Amino acid sequence: ADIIARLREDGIQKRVIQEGRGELPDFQDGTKATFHYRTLHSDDEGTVLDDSRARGKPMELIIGKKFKLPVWETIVCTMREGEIAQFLCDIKHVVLYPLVAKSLRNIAGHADLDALQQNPQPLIFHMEMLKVESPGTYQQDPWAMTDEEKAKAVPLIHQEGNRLYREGHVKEAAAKYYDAIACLKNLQMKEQPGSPEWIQLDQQITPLLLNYCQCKLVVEEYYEVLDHCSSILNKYDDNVKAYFKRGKAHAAVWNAQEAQADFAKVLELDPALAPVVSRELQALEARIRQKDEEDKARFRGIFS
Amino acid sequence: EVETFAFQAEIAQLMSLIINTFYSNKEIFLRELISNASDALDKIRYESLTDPSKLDSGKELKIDIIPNPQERTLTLVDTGIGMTKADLINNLGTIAKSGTKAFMEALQAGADISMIGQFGVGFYSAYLVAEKVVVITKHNDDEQYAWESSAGGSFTVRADHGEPIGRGTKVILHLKEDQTEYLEERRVKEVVKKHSQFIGYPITLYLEKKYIDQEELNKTKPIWTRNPDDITQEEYGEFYKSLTNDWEDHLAVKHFSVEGQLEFRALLFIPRRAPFDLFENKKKKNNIKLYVRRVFIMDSCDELIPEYLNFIRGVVDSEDLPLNISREMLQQSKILKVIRKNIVKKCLELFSELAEDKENYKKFYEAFSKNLKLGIHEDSTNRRRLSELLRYHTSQSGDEMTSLSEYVSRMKETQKSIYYITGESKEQVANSAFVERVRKRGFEVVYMTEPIDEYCVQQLKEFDGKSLVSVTKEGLELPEDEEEKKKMEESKAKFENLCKLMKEILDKKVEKVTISNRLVSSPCCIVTSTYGWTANMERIMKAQALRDNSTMGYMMAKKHLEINPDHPIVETLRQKAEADKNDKAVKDLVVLLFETALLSSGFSLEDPQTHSNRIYRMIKLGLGIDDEDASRMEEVD
Amino acid sequence: EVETFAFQAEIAQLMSLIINTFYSNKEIFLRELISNASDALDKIRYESLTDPSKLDSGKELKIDIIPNPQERTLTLVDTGIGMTKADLINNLGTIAKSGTKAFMEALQAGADISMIGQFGVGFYSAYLVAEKVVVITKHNDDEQYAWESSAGGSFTVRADHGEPIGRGTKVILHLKEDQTEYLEERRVKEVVKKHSQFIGYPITLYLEKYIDQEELNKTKPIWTRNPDDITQEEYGEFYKSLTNDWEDHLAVKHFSVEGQLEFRALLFIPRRAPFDLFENKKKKNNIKLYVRRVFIMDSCDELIPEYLNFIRGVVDSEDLPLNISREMLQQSKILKVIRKNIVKKCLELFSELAEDKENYKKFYEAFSKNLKLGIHEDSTNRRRLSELLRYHTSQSGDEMTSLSEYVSRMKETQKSIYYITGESKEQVANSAFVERVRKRGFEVVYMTEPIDEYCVQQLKEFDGKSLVSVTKEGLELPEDEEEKKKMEESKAKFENLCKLMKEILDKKVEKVTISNRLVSSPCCIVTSTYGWTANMERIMKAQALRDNSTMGYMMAKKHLEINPDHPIVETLRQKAEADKNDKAVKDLVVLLFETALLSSGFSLEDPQTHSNRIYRMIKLGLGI
Amino acid sequence: PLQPPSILEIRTKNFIFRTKHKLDFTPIGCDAKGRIVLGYTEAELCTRGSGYQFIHAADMLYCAESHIRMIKTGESGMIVFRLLTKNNRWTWVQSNARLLYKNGRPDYIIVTQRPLTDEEGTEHLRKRNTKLPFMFTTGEAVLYEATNPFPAIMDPL
Ligand SMILES: Nc1ncnc2c1ncn2[C@@H]1O[C@H](COP(=O)(O)OP(=O)(O)O)[C@@H](O)[C@H]1O
Ligand SMILES: Nc1ncnc2c1ncn2[C@@H]1O[C@H](COP(=O)(O)OP(=O)(O)O)[C@@H](O)[C@H]1O
Ligand SMILES: O=C1Nc2ccccc2/C1=C1/Nc2ccccc2C1=O
Ligand code: MOO
Ligand code: MOO
Ligand SMILES: [Mg+2]
Ligand SMILES: [Mg+2]
């Protein structure tokens, strides 16, 4: 109805600079807004403690799930698209400021934003809004989605990861597979273990985790693959692909004794393709023989 | 109507109770009879003080024991005051009536006499071994009488004519057919030594060896009744040798007394060497004994002194302690706690004052440092005082052992901690890699090279306000400068990749790989977390027979691997890891270095044969001894 | 003439003796009073057996305890037989006069009654805590009287006209100022639990919280019943009530003895070992001794050996002679006989449990340490205890076997049992000592506890066959004539190399010889027949309280054994024959000795020398 | 002369005790030392909740993860966390829970634990892993929402 008259009575005092274009967004419970921040002390010393548009790092913020600090939400409520304004706030709104910017810039021992910890005061906030989209249009990021919708979202993530992998890109496929795996695992906490639903959820993560291990092995990160493969084999102990990947990693990191055993387990569990396992064994033997010859040359009489 | 009555007794049942249920050992009958004789001699001697005519019937006060296997009788003759007919009837014939108590009560207050006997039932312990008892008495104011009975509800008194007893009493026991063990020399000697050792009059024994041989059996005297100032060290040595049968004399002695509501006198000796079976727990310890009026009551039983002070030999004598009916126990057992407190305090004072004489404290420490350290591990009240009696080798000291006080007085200004290392031997610790930097910087390190030192330092947290810091634990801090801090930070930043790789290779053997701050010439070392067993403590605890192997996981510490940035091997490893992180040689070198550090840091390998095989492989090398579905399998699902 | 008098007694001093020097604990007055009440209840129950009309003043047989902090009094009410005026004057007013003994003697032979109390002095323990004692009584064929005294040498009896009581006695103690702790709930509950837990009649405490009444002795003494009439469920309930354990028992032995010495015993085995089994600071109260269901003393190491400390149970007797305080036995030599019987029956129980497999596996996992301690300590039962031992073996895989199974599986050419002691199973299994012994097909027992090292000191032979360590010098094996010819040829071939090695390692070993137990490793260190092994040395060095100043004289001497068929040894022999003073052979011999030392269970005096050797080799390998 | 091997020992005491728990970690039966460590009686332990009431709020996720691992493999490794006493205090404990099977199915849980001091507990907490591998990435979850319904293990029954 009338929010401008509401802000003043709430304690804050704000002044508009350039009116934005378009109508006022609904800003219901759950909404994504993109905008820039540039915060500077009001009168104590006048300097700038944190800035985004000064260097060009947008500060994304979805409106109203919990967002401990309620000042930012109320501030962006009365701003439309392309509206630039500056203003200050009372100490009460921003008393707990250090619990916001401690990492929002580092994740991407502060001496500026820690100044408030020893002497609070009102602080100026220079805002600039660019875009504001209600839920439904923008691709919701995985952490903000609801369980019932993330359940149906996982397959699209799986397919996007596969499509990226086949094209010839890995790091991005790894990121997509990681997001899908985390999304599935968070759901399992919603369900009791051992029950049919927990095992049902577990059934659809092993393929994704196998793809993740495949990509990790391709990017030459072997030690990581071993942990995930061991986690899979401990519960199942009947995965041919899991044993194959674990043995390949063991061979890659010179763990011949275990690589051979895992390859033998694959052979006894999947006798179909002997040529591939034998080829891997031969390659491992050739590499080991080469290194043995080099070491024999290296020592060659150190005593006398 | 309200009637009024007086209590009564059943004499037959009372006698049965006295004979059967009062005394557990049948040997204390001799103690009771000797106590009675001593009381009689005290009475006659005191009476003769103000009337020397009372000794006209003999001037010597003594006690004699005369076995007679032919008649199967035992005689105990004394030349004491003796009993009149009326006294005989009133004292021997009445249960719970004591002539000694009445004599003491009628005595003028403020006189020197301390007589055993206050209950009036001791004489009837003689029927523990005797089927019939005959008493022949003779007083200075009466004729000689004979008192006879079998504890069968009545006794007879008659005038006795025969060999005249000049003055005193004679008790003849007709031993039972199964109690003839008390007619032999060994048994009587042992009983008298155990119970009546310090009676104030000679106790002669007469035996057939023919002729009548004699032995005093109580030659030694209770020197603890004399003033401590009057006694010379030679007399103390003689008493100690007589008490402990030691061919050499004591090392130190303490002679104190306590006055007040509870009073006693004590004599504490420190032996010159540790007995060969000091700590064995199947010994029934009797190091300190308790006496009441020079009569043995009970052994220590770890009630009069803590277990870690069990090497002290001594005596505790009191005048007024409430005893049980069988005088081998105390009523109000809580008095033993007060006695123990006093004894412990005085023992600590003795140790503290003996520390000034360095030469003798050297011997005492070499003998009983184990006991001192065990006391530190056990005693919480006296921990601070005990900590000041410890002596250790240090890096700065030579072949001598120094105290912690000297260490504190010799510290640097910046130093805030006491540095120590525990190991298996002095040679092992002195040459370890944990102490290179500490010793190079000029700090002092305390060497503790015995298993008991682990238990000792578990409870010793700080001395004189300064904490104790182990050089084998993670988190060692030394005083530093700004340039050193900058160098450490730069080194740490330069070696992050190598640390990550080394942690990856040692997947589960270590908990962390860091940059060392205590190494000089070694490449690496292994230290343990702040909380949990050190390598030495873990080694000692895993070798204990009576240890619960299920609890090991709760008490062990995590291993941290630390590497030296200023060593050629480490620099070579860093360069190789930068060149190619999956190199085989790097992996083999990392594993070999970890195993060598594990062996040198005090740990034991899970399988030593793996290390042996690696070494053998190196030796042999030195000597020169010797389809289309494929693409489908590993693409997607 | 010959006179003749009668023994007299002086009453005042006698009362002082009874009140001041008989009992060392003031809490036993409750025990004495409850014992008296129980005897009275037994008397009335027995009397009503033939004349049911006797129980016309009441049918319930119970005991009551009623604190009264306001008046500072404690009251013990019972519904027993009571006593008349004549009894009040005689029984309660005469010292050393027992009415219970007279009642028991009046009975005919084989009576179904066993009453506590035969001395006639227990009632006066009430004056340990009380200033004045009032006794209200009421017999069937008599009025109701009040007895009063203050231990002042006289007592009064008057006909009471207060609130009537149908039958029985009511003792009122006017507590002293300093003895008011006995009016509290916790103290009374604790005392009753400690002393009169198993009295045969309900004991109820009345408290203000409306006067709530609470029964104190809920559990019955099941040991009086017959063993075969008791189910395991009630056995377990009794065990849980006794030991306070939230779990059930594993096994139970319930037996009896007859003759001059008669007692009944219940013995239980816990399912799990307490975490403070060997904790020194604990009282030996695992087994309690009772006489006529009244607690006497705890085990105190005289009722059972120290290696059976995990046994929980009860020993009850009817005719043990006690002392006046009833806190110990006269002629304490009976405890030896009782202990002998208990040990025999515990061993019998273990043997019976051995028949079951899973239960015995649980029991062994819990108390094998105690069994081995018993083997080390006890010599009479060593043979019986040796058949309860279970060990891992080279041929048993993951399970554990017994020595008899080992002997039944022996080969006709095998005269001895072979074992090895070490730090862990992995270390011993992959040891260099067991290479050939396992290759030939023989069987080796694995021992991996320090208590095992203690144990083998006493277990010299089993079933007539001796035990042999594979870590000691002169290991004997069956052989063929060709093997001996080859051994002699090898010795002749390697004499010179052995001589040179013994020269190089002066005063580090006492011999260098040719091994007969190595297959794949080049060398190993063994100890002489006399002295400690490496494992025993490791265990002894770690004893904090042991005097190790003279340990050098008990340490065994170490012999180095060489493998004739190893490439390294052959190359060493060739190098030595070529040039015996070379540095290569010296360094190689030193390195081999140190590595064998490390792998054989010993510890180097200075590990830093070995570490520096390895570091030098690494540096040379890296080219630095 | 010289002495033969004996079994002289120092006999160190410890404060490790066992407890019996239901599938939902409801304490049903405790060792004697446990009563001293956690002020309670026989009845209160049963009629106080379901175990998760005892866990300190900060430690809830750690304990839930350990419970998941215990169910998956039958026993959780050592874990250090806080427990709720009758006096509302908190005591650090080092616990290791084990799952028992009666017939191919879980029956109850036996926990062996050791009380810790505040210093050792704080030390263990500091080093505690801040995150688990497949977390939700730095999506500012603890900033924007910071509200999760917690694992279904904790939901009563
Ligand atoms: N040898 C003796 N000479 C003189 N009087 C004796 C002798 N033996 C016993 N009596 C007297 O007989 C009494 C027996 O008492 P006893 O049972 O010994 O208890 P207590 O020693 O406390 O008196 C003593 O009071 C003592 O006066
Ligand atoms: N509560 C009671 N009811 C009936 N008779 C009692 C009671 N208490 C004591 N008496 C009688 O008074 C006597 C006192 O003896 P006591 O001190 O109990 O020794 P004891 O128990 O060995 O007889 C007993 O013999 C008993 O017959
Ligand atoms: O170890 C405990 N001891 C206790 C004593 C009382 C109540 C709970 C617990 C313990 C729990 N260990 C746990 C492990 C995982 C999840 C939950 C839990 C617990 O509640
Ligand atoms: O001589 Mo007594 O009867 O023990 O006081
Ligand atoms: O009730 Mo008694 O007088 O201890 O046998
Ligand atoms: Mg006497
Ligand atoms: Mg009685």
Residue numbers in the entry:
A (entry chain C): 2 to 109, 134 to 329
B (entry chain B): 11 to 219, 275 to 691, 714 to 724
C (entry chain A): 11 to 219, 276 to 690
D (entry chain D): 271 to 427
Can I see the authors' text?
The aryl hydrocarbon receptor (AHR) is a ligand-dependent transcription factor that mediates a broad spectrum of (patho)physiological processes in response to numerous substances including pollutants, natural products and metabolites. AHR belongs to the basic helix-loop-helix (bHLH) PER-ARNT-SIM (PAS) protein family. In the absence of ligand, AHR resides in the cytoplasm forming a complex with several other partners including heat shock protein 90 (Hsp90) and co-chaperones like X-associated protein 2 (XAP2, also known as AIP or ARA9) and p23. Upon ligand binding, AHR undergoes conformational changes leading to exposure of the nuclear localization signal (NLS) and therefore triggering a translocation of the complex into the nucleus where AHR is released and interacts with the AHR nuclear translocator (ARNT).
The linker is threaded through the Hsp90 lumen formed by two Hsp90 molecules, thereby positioning the two PAS domains on the opposite sides of the Hsp90 dimer. The AHR ligand-binding pocket (LBP) takes a form of an elongated channel extending perpendicularly between helices Cα and Fα. The hallmark of most AHR ligands is their planarity. Our structure reveals that indirubin intercalates between H291, F295 and P297 on one side of the ligand and I325, C333, F351 and L353 on the other side, the two layers of residues exerting a critical role in the selection of indirubin, and most likely other AHR ligands, based on its planar structure. The second indole ring is primarily involved in two hydrogen bonds with S365 and Q383 via its carbonyl and amine moieties, respectively, in addition to several van der Waals contacts with H291, P297, G321, F324, F351, L353 and V381.
